[PDB]
């Protein structure tokens, strides 16, 4: 119907006006007085080797000691960062993997890819034994990210523009989130684990609520595909990190982008994003085999993490924040400090 | 009538929102990250004492054994001839694979690992990069006369960097069905009449040249061409010829004798 299109345009115009009136002083103005962080220097400690192919993901554990890797190798090595010991090395039926997760309790891991399944494995459930527990099928389109919010629940992005939620015990999908037009590319659960954000290839992230399964808010300030998003510590913001070569820090309660992290020399896209313990420092990976730290309040660079020859395809900070880890297409996983 | 009628309902759900604006939200971010600045190891160096940078010695043994089988597991993958066939989805994929759904095939001391992705959505820009390093693509566009969407994929891969060195093989499938279809209806009905002829030899060339139009046809990535039929016996033989040629070429390039 013609009116529905015109109605959509009119309500979109009014939504921006509601946003436009809300923005009185951009984030940079009030935070001008605070002393910048200053150039920080973190040098690698551990180059965890063992993968024979570019590694596409990784994840930490609440203990802040055990890692996970996923790579086209076809393996899912679980490391001990403190000693670089390959605690586990799981194979799987389909070599191709694009994500991996580590259960917050530490008894499970999940790893999906270009097969439309997020298969869970009973990591250290039986001594010297680990096997495929569940296979969550029925999720059309490739699978791009899985996350645990409890022992029995998984939120998974997909290639078919969906973020279904699962019940591992029954292996049946409970609540599905829809509304994205381009395939979803990342997740980030809130600390309270009632809300989560999903950036997709429609240049628009959306805020979902786990309980009632509705889209609370839609954010759009980007110019290309959104690749990897992290969720601000306090719970009222999240960075974006798109192929636009820039990170934008949005904030809930305002429905607007607070700041933009971009420099004219950075010419490539972004494939990973993370925050720090206090959230002050933003860490983002790039296609130019270079992760550089960002000042989340000042939008100025604060260091580089050049330790790879190929794209930095993943990175994460420990739950306690004492360390950082980056993986890359060069097939080596690095642990910084 | 109902494709975005749900979206307009959604946008109203985003409208009646109690919003605390930037002149309290920057303080919200400012207040949290200043009160928690004392506990951030990266923002502030954590004391040197707390920074660390029986079963374990056994674990050092597990790592070696785990790291041992990785080399052996990589042995098979090292000798594997990786392939993929796009074919724009619907095509003569059944016959060719018969002679992600990854089948397998071994011949003359090699281990082919054919990869077929027809179960994905049309937008493949965020996962096609996984196939960088495949030995060669195998196009098998059938002349069942999607034809158009197949050509557009040819444009993308032939002009991308990840596939700049991976050779491309092109197959024309279902020759019997194609000839039966075109013995009455000419190609010029839907294409320009540059063909000027209705046969099976020129038509195969006329379909080919459209593909040749969009390529660089470099001395390295020259396409391979052998129209194939479901009642033929030389399809796999020509695939083998092309693949062994590509392997020899990669070897020579490695030797610097290319």
């Amino acid at each position, epitope marked *: 119907l013609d009116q529905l299109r015109q109605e959509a345009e009119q309500l*979109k115009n009014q939504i921006r006006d509601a946003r436009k009136a809300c923005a009185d002083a951009t984030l940079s103005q009030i935070t001008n007085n605070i002393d910048p962080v200053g150039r920080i220097q973190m040098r690698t400690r551990r180059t965890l080797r063992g993968h024979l192919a570019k590694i596409y993901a990784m994840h930490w554990g609440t203990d802040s000691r055990l890692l996970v890797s996923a790579s086209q190798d076809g393996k899912l090595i679980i490391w001990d960062s403190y000693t670089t010991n390959k605690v586990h090395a799981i194979p799987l039926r389909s070599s191709w993997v694009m994500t991996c997760a580590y259960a917050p309790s530490g008894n499970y891991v999940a790893c999906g890819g270009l097969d439309n399944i997020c298969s869970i494995y009973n990591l250290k459930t039986r001594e010297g034994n680990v096997r495929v527990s569940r296979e969550l099928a029925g999720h059309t389109g490739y699978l791009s990210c899985c996350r645990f919010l409890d022992d029995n629940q998984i939120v998974t992005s997909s290639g078919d523009t969906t973020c279904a939620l699962w019940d591992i015990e029954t292996g049946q999908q409970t609540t599905t989130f829809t509304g994205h*037009t*381009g395939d979803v590319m990342s997740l980030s659960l809130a600390p309270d684990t009632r809300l989560f954000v999903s950036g997709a*290839c*429609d*240049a628009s992230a959306k805020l979902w609520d786990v309980r009632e399964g509705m889209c609370r808010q839609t954010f*759009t300030g980007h*110019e*290309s*595909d959104i690749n990897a998003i992290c969720f601000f510590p306090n719970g009222n913001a999240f960075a974006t990190g798109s*192929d*636009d*070569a820039t990170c934008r820090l949005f904030d809930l309660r305002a429905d607007q982008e607070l700041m933009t992290y971009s420099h004219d020399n950075i*010419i*490539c*896209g972004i494939t990973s994003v993370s925050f720090s313990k206090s959230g002050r420092l933003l860490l983002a990976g790039y296609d130019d085999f270079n992760c550089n730290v960002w000042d989340a309040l000042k939008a100025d660079r604060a260091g580089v993490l050049a330790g790879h020859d190929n794209r930095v395809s993943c990175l994460g900070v420990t739950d306690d924040g004492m360390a950082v880890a980056t993986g890359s297409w060069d097939s080596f996983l690095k642990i910084w400090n | 009538i109902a494709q975005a009628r749900k979206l307009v309902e959604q946008l109203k759900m985003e409208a009646n929102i109690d919003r605390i604006k930037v002149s309290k939200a920057a303080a919200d971010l400012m207040a949290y990250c200043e009160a928690h600045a004392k506990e951030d190891p990266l923002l502030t160096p954590v004391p040197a004492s707390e920074n660390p940078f029986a079963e374990d010695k056994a674990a050092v043994e597990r790592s070696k054994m785990i790291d041992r089988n990785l080399r052996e597991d990589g042995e098979k993958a090292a000798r594997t001839v990786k392939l993929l066939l796009l074919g724009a989805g619907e095509s003569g994929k059944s016959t060719i694979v018969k002679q992600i759904i990854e089948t397998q095939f071994s011949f003359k001391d090699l281990n082919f690992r054919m990869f077929d992705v027809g179960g994905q959505r*049309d*937008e*493949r*820009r965020k996962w*096609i990069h996984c196939f960088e390093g495949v030995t060669a693509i195998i196009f098998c566009v059938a002349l069942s006369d*999607r034809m*158009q*969407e197949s*050509m*557009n994929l040819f*444009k*993308s891969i032939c*002009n*991308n*960097k990840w596939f700049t060195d991976t050779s491309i093989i092109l197959f024309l499938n279902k020759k019997d069905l194609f000839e039966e279809k075109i013995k009455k209806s000419p190609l010029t009905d*839907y*294409y*320009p009449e540059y063909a000027g002829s209705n046969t099976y030899e020129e038509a195969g060339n006329y379909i080919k*040249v*459209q593909f040749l*139009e*969009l390529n660089m046809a470099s001395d390295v990535k020259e396409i391979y061409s052998h129209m194939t039929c479901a009642t033929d016996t030389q399809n796999v033989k020509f695939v083998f010829d092309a693949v062994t040629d590509i392997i020899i070429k990669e070897n020579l390039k490695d030797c610097g004798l290319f």
Partner: nanobody
Amino acid sequence: QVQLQESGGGLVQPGGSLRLSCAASGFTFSNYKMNWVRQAPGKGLQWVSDISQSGASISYTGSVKGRFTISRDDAKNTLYLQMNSLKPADTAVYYCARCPAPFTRDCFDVTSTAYAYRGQGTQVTVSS
């Protein structure tokens, strides 16, 4: 919201001339490769023009050679395509497809269904 609005589509007798534009907005229309994809009756989305980022590297399909020209103008922030001596078979809905990756010549899924960076298009028509 990146928007690319087209204009100029209209009826034209065979053998004539016609130029149509694309006033983009929401992004920096200086570092994005761009295309012109048409959707003729009885066919899907086809690829025609391949204006690169610089403006010197431009490609065409065999059906379109020696007749169509494409151009960019950063100052006016618009894309330009022109059809000369067009045949009746140019009876499609020309769309203005921007490519997803800035600063690169990788135009990968511009003709795919439900793509996010091509405007609604103008119903170019050719009568007889």
